Amino acid sequence: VVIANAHNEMIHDAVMDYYGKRMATCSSDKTIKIFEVEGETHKLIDTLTGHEGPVWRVDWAHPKFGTILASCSYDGKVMIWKEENGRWSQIAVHAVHSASVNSVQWAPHEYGPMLLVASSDGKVSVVEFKENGTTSPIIIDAHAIGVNSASWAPATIGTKESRKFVTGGADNLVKIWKYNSDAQTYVLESTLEGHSDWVRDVAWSPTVLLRSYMASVSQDRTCIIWTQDNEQGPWKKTLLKEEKFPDVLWRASWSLSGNVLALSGGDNKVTLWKENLEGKWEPAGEVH
């Protein structure tokens, strides 16, 4: 299905909701448009205004918290929106960054409604919502030059110390952070070297089987698949494929099941990958 001309300016992110029925899009026009997609039919519900610059990404909160969406933008703010009775309205704002905010991701639901935020100021902020409504955020210096992405690890399978998330920055590193009670915040677990240029995205696989999988995608035109078998053990570096991709890679995304990766590059192409016996990666559906 296609939804043509959703915006006039370039669209930077399009994310469906927990049901794969509703969808949000953000653009350089500075708005977020919400659509309801049925079969091969769709309907624009509303346009969200408020941001003062391009909107880079958006994410949907788990349904048990209601119909909520988070957005981040060049303006350095994260805005929270909600749909109450077919109508949307800004319900909160997070603005602790001195530069562009590049990603925002809702935490696994068991954790309550939490927001992981990455900014070009070099910091990451973790935000939850008080009973009253406002927010109390955790701020950490995570990368020199900038942070471009931060993705949550799946919830361990209610202890808070087991919460981890991975970041990727313009210093070429991929980092792993874990919450520590004593420190009252997230602390550095590992630093993963393997890129020669800015990491543009990192995604942790939700896969529920022995090994943990994370993917870093870079300006150096590579995709690394990190794996770990032991909780405190080292992460193994495995190039998605031996040769550089035609262009820069911007996003990586895992399937809910099957552990299938979907890569997005500069040649505006999207490749699907799966892991074989040899523990290596190959196309998951009719290559092109």
């Binding site: 669209i11 994310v15 969808m23 089987l209 911007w250 979907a262 997005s264 500069g266 999207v270 559906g285």
Partner: protein, 347 residues
């Protein structure tokens, strides 16, 4: 040169139901497709079977590229069952593979011994009761029988039978069997008769409880448990089937799942391939069989239906997923949450 912001990108994301979302080439539109993943197809044969209630195609498909020998035995079973029908299958699986009279009193004779004498007395003395006793305390059983077999008393007419069982029961298998029949019980046969004569036990169970399906099924299950514990796997499923015990069969098939999933793994399959093929074959086998029995409460079984559900929804087939979800206890908030997600997703 590299730039910090605004570069075009497909920004693809996976979404529920096996959907792939991405920005269009012009960068002002959005595309939502359902990508082709080699080996990841929607199970239409099962959807068809489940709706038509015709499992022939499904049975045949499995029957062709079947795995181990036991699994072949199982599917073959389902093939026949699907043809002849539940009743006919059971009838065939449980089925099996005057005289000289002339006495003429001759010559003279006499009663010798205090025994042959006292009994004779008891008789003509019209005292058949004691005559039986004296015949029994002595080892003159046929005598006691022939006598009681001529009276219309019961307590006595049965005192003789108990006497017979009392000393011959342990010395003869036929004698031991007659016992249970005479006492109208099968407990001894179900628990101790050679597992090789199981069809006899079965038939016995059937002819003792024709108006009591509960007792019959209970016994039939007792015998089945025993068969299984003695390596007679196939005959246990038959007894279980005849008793409408889908639980028993389900458990057997569940316990064998891990090993099955391991043989597929050795067949040079990845964890996913192994899990997926194993699960699907397990569910199809169960659904088909579940169709010919008389029956979801099992804890492990529900978790697997829930695993089958996720592999299903990722093929986009919310119709099949719904079908299976509805067969699970809505009292389970997992099943509850799942139903809701699918509902909203497909609706």
């Amino acid at each position: 040169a590299p730039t910090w912001y605004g570069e075009p990108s497909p920004a693809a994301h996976w979404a529920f139901g096996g959907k792939l979302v991405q920005i269009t080439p012009d960068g002002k539109g959005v595309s939502i497709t359902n990508p082709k993943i080699s080996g990841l197809e929607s199970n239409t044969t099962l959807s068809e079977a489940l709706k038509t209630k015709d499992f022939k195609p499904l049975i045949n498909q499995r029957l062709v590229k079947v795995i181990d020998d036991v699994n072949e035995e199982d599917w073959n079973m389902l093939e026949k069952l699907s043809m002849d029908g539940t009743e006919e299958f059971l009838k065939e699986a449980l089925a099996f593979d005057q005289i000289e009279t002339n006495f003429q009193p001759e010559g003279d004779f006499s009663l010798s011994g205090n025994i042959e004498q006292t009994i004779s007395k008891n008789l003509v003395s019209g005292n058949i009761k004691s005559a039986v006793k004296n015949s029994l305390e002595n080892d003159l059983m046929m005598e006691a029988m022939v006598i009681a077999l001529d009276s219309n008393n019961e307590r006595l007419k049965e005192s003789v039978k108990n006497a017979y069982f009392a000393k011959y029961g342990s010395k003869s298998s036929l004698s031991r069997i007659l016992y249970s029949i005479s006492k109208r019980e099968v407990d001894d046969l179900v628990e101790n008769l050679d597992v090789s004569q199981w069809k006899f036990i079965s038939k016995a169970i059937q002819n003792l409880y024709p108006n009591d399906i509960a007792q019959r099924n209970e016994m039939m299950i007792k015998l089945g448990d025993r068969m299984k514990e003695n390596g007679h796997r196939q005959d246990s499923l038959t007894l279980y089937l005849a008793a409408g015990s889908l639980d028993k069969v389900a458990s057997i098939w569940l316990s064998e799942f891990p090993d099955l999933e391991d043989k597929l793994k050795k067949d040079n399959k990845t964890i996913y391939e192994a899990h997926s093929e194993c699960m699907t074959e397990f569910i199809e086998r169960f659904t088909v069989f579940s169709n010919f029995i008389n029956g979801i409460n099992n804890e492990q079984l529900i978790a697997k239906f829930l695993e089958f559900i996720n592999l299903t929804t990722s093929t986009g087939n919310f119709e099949l997923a719904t079908e299976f979800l509805n067969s699970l206890p809505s009292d389970n908030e997992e099943v509850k949450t799942e139903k809701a997600r699918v509902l909203i997703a497909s609706g």
